[PDB]
Amino acid sequence: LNIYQY
Amino acid sequence: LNIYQY
Amino acid sequence: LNIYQY
Amino acid sequence: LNIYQY
Amino acid sequence: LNIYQY
Amino acid sequence: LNIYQY
Amino acid sequence: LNIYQY
Amino acid sequence: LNIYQY
Amino acid sequence: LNIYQY
Amino acid sequence: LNIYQY
Amino acid sequence: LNIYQY
Amino acid sequence: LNIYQY
Amino acid sequence: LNIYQY
Amino acid sequence: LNIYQY
Amino acid sequence: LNIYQY
Amino acid sequence: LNIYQY
Amino acid sequence: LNIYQY
Amino acid sequence: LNIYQY
């Protein structure tokens, strides 16, 4: 699980 | 699961 | 689990 | 678990 | 567990 | 457990 | 447990 | 346990 | 246990 | 200029 | 200029 | 200029 | 200039 | 200039 | 200038 | 100038 | 100038 | 000038 939140 | 949120 | 929050 | 919060 | 909080 | 709080 | 608080 | 508090 | 308090 | 490279 | 490199 | 490099 | 390097 | 290097 | 080096 | 070196 | 070296 | 060296 990789989560990138910008 | 890869999630990219811009 | 990698979480990046900007 | 790696968490980066900016 | 690595947590980076800026 | 490594915690960095700025 | 390493804790860095600035 | 290492704790750094600034 | 090492504690640094500034 | 927005560049997304995966 | 925003650059995202994965 | 924002640069994200993973 | 913000640079994030992982 | 903010630089984050992991 | 803020520099974080891990 | 703030420099954090781990 | 603040310098933290671990 | 604050210098912390561990």
Residue numbers in the entry:
A (entry chain A), B (entry chain A), C (entry chain A), D (entry chain A), E (entry chain A), F (entry chain A), ...: 1 to 6
Can you quote the paper on this entry?
However, while 45LNIYQY50 (R1), 47IYQYGG52 (R1), and 137VTQVGF142 (R5) formed unbranched and elongated amyloid-like fibrils, the 129TASNSS134 (R4-R5 loop) segment formed scarce and more amorphous structures. The 45LNIYQY50 (R1), 47IYQYGG52 (R1), and 137VTQVGF142 (R5) segments bound the amyloid indicator dye ThT and demonstrated dose-dependent amyloid fibrillation curves with short lag times. 45LNIYQY50 polymerized with the shortest lag time. 45LNIYQY50 and 47IYQYGG52, which are overlapping segments from the R1 repeat, adopted very similar structures. Both segments, as well as 137VTQVGF142 (R5), adopted a classical amyloid steric zipper architecture, with two possible dry interfaces between paired β-sheets. The β-strands were oriented parallel to each other along the β-sheets. These three structures are class 1 steric zippers, as defined by Sawaya and Eisenberg according to the organization of the β-strands and β-sheets. Specifically, the R1 45LNIYQY50 and 47IYQYGG52 segments and the R5 137VTQVGF142 segment formed fibrils that bound the amyloid indicator dye ThT and formed canonical amyloid class 1 steric zippers. These segments contain Gln49 or Gln139 (marked in bold in 45LNIYQY50, 47IYQYGG52, and 137VTQVGF142), which are critical for fibrillation and cannot be mutated to asparagine without interfering with curli assembly. The R1 segment 45LNIYQY50 and the R5 segment 137VTQVGF142 also induced fibrillation of Aβ1–40. In agreement with the hypothesis that the steric zipper segments serve as spines of CsgA fibrils, we found that the D-peptides also inhibited the fibrillation of the R1 45LNIYQY50 and R5 137VTQVGF142 spine segments in a dose-dependent manner.
Curli proteins are produced via dedicated and tightly regulated cellular processes, and their fibrils mediate host cell adhesion and invasion, lead to immune system activation, and scaffold bacterial communities known as biofilms. The two key players in curli fibril formation are CsgA and CsgB, the major and minor curli subunits, respectively. CsgA, a 151-residue protein, consists of five imperfect sequence repeats (R1-R5), defined by regularly spaced serine (Ser), glutamine (Gln) and asparagine (Asn) residues. The first and the last repeats (R1 and R5) form amyloid fibrils in isolation and are critical to CsgA seeding and nucleation by CsgB, while the other repeats (R2-R4) contain 'gatekeeper' residues that temper the amyloidogenicity of CsgA.
